[PDB]
Amino acid sequence: MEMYETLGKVGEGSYGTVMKCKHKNTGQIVAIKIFYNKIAMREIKFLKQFHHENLVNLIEVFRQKKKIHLVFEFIDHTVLDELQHYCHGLESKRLRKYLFQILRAIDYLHSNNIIHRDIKPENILVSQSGITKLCDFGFARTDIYDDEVATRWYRAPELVLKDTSYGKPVDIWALGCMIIEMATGNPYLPSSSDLDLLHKIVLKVGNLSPHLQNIFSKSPIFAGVVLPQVQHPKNARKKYPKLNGLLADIVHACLQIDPADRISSSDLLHHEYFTRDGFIEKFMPELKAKLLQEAKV
Amino acid sequence: MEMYETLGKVGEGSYGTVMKCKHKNTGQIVAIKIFYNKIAMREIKFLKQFHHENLVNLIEVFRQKKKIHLVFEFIDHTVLDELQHYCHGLESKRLRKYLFQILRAIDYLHSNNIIHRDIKPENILVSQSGITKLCDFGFARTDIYDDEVATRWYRAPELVLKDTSYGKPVDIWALGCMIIEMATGNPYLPSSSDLDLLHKIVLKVGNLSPHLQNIFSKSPIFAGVVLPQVQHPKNARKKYPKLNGLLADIVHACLQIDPADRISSSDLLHHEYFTRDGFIEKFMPELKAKLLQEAKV
Ligand SMILES: N#CCc1ccc(Nc2nccc(Nc3cc(C4CCCC4)n[nH]3)n2)cc1
Ligand SMILES: N#CCc1ccc(Nc2nccc(Nc3cc(C4CCCC4)n[nH]3)n2)cc1
Ligand code: NA
Ligand code: NA
Ligand SMILES: [Zn+2]
Ligand SMILES: [Zn+2]
Ligand SMILES: [Zn+2]
Ligand SMILES: [Zn+2]
């Protein structure tokens, strides 16, 4: 006997579905993920051990009609919603606040040696008061194939080339891509296939590092294929000239072809972008007080 | 006994594969489309009746290893190749020459009441001398579902909403999108789902026309969903301000939400964009003489 009034469908994928619902007794508004199973179980495994105030809350798990249901707290919208509803990207003060909270989340995970593996705008939830939370841990790890169209756009060059090892740096690449999109409103590496993606990476970001060039030139998927050979500015302000200067600096530090050249999440949190005008010192009390003032009501 | 030396793979889709090959006796370089069948047969049906100098030549058809093989002439590259290899889009003089020839092709088809149904950069072939040819007629008609990722980006709002009738105007919408991409280097409506696409159409182009709004608000796929409500400049130069003025004017005329408001292919060929400086009068002899000088050798 369904304990939930399904209210509407807010998502769907190769995996299944997210439904906005209302517990029949609680009256509580939830988001229920419903699959058709490794991925369900490893998401559950993760949410049992890991907790943070910029990660989404899991409430319960049931298995009605031979399917697994994951009830989460409901958060007003996503960053994808913002980019789909408003022109030209996020206002700059608001962008900074989102990014810091996104970074707090990613750093928490990276300190615990978790790779998220699916950073993108839909998986950033945004409450009405503007507290952001990270979600979707089905592919998180200490490779499971992610068949999703949007996911390709944020994939790092080592994932695209199927390098046998990869790690935390793939979350940093995806973040750098998302930052550009949140700043301009436009996805940076939109692509319709991996071959397309590889060309765009090389065209817009940089040539393959030697190891990745080696894997490319030995890969049978990509035989005959010669990549674009392109010069790029070495200066961040030049290379992303439509962005705020320090924002350009971060993006440059994220989008390095060689994963080992990418900035860590720790260092990103301490970047001049966030410390310039005492923002962290002003923001953290305002954050702690929201979560206070909201927790009471 | 394969009569062809397969040389390399230049394409692949939900349909099958394109291989660059060399006939073992002729030594002739070909592109062979290989399926796994309605779509094969309707492409063949089309290529038997229809012929033009800006459409790709079919040579023969065979059925080896329970599969259908369509041997075409081989053309150096595609417009997709150009956008994947070079920064910031096509040089303006070259863009104009491509578009005119693309339009000659589309108009030829529309005069014969054919809807192409899959205008996009990969399906524009470009020879070394820069003669362009249209290809891929599997979905051409006087709706078969097109499962391809890139295809979504060029789909008109009526296709997205599954309107029971649509026609020639969907080729004009797709062309307008492709023009923007060829001009800037960036796809205009990159999207990862139809819901995403609908938001971007409304955000960047215009609100749904009343009939399409009706279908949207009655559609079960899209229930609960409220689209972005957005004002757009009415002037073409303003609305696409990074384009050449007359090029902006064409794009505006293509990208009208109501298909019945879109410009015809006939009128596009006669636009000021092509007549301003006597270009058609200068271009057509240069075209006819290339095809002469090339036909001899
Ligand atoms: N997982 C996942 C991916 C996903 C994430 C968001 C959405 N769409 C969406 N769209 C609007 C609001 C919203 N609020 C929300 C969702 C959740 C859950 C975490 C996650 C599954 C419920 N909590 N609060 N989600 C759709 C898919
Ligand atoms: N059909 C179709 C779609 C398609 C079109 C082009 C390509 N890729 C490509 N990439 C580089 C060159 C090229 N030259 C070429 C292809 C053809 C055929 C018409 C069409 C099928 C062979 N003639 N000349 N095609 C891949 C797929
Ligand atoms: Na995911
Ligand atoms: Na096609
Ligand atoms: Zn929306
Ligand atoms: Zn390796
Ligand atoms: Zn290429
Ligand atoms: Zn209708």
Numbering used by the authors:
A (entry chain A), B (entry chain A): 1 to 36, 44 to 149, 155 to 309
Question: What text appears in the publication on this structure?
Answer:
By contrast, the CDKL1, CDKL3, and CDKL5 structures displayed characteristics of active kinases. Inhibitor ASC67 was designed as an affinity reagent (Statsuk et al., 2008) and was among the top screening hits for all CDKLs tested. Catalytic site interactions may help support the active conformation of these kinases. Instead, CDKL2 and CDKL3 showed an unusual amphipathic helix, αJ, while the constructs for CDKL1 and CDKL5 were truncated and lacked this region. Notably, deleting the αJ region reduced the activities of CDKL2 and CDKL3, whereas CDKL1 and CDKL5 were largely unchanged. These results are consistent with the observed structures, and they further show the importance of the unprecedented αJ helix for CDKL2 and CDKL3 function.
CDKL family proteins contain a conserved N-terminal kinase domain and variable C termini. The kinase domains of CDKL1, CDKL2, CDKL3, and CDKL5 were crystallized using a phosphomimetic Asp-X-Glu (DXE) substitution and in the presence of identified inhibitors. The CDKL structures all contain broad spectrum ATP-competitive inhibitors that bind to the kinase hinge region via 3 hydrogen bonds.
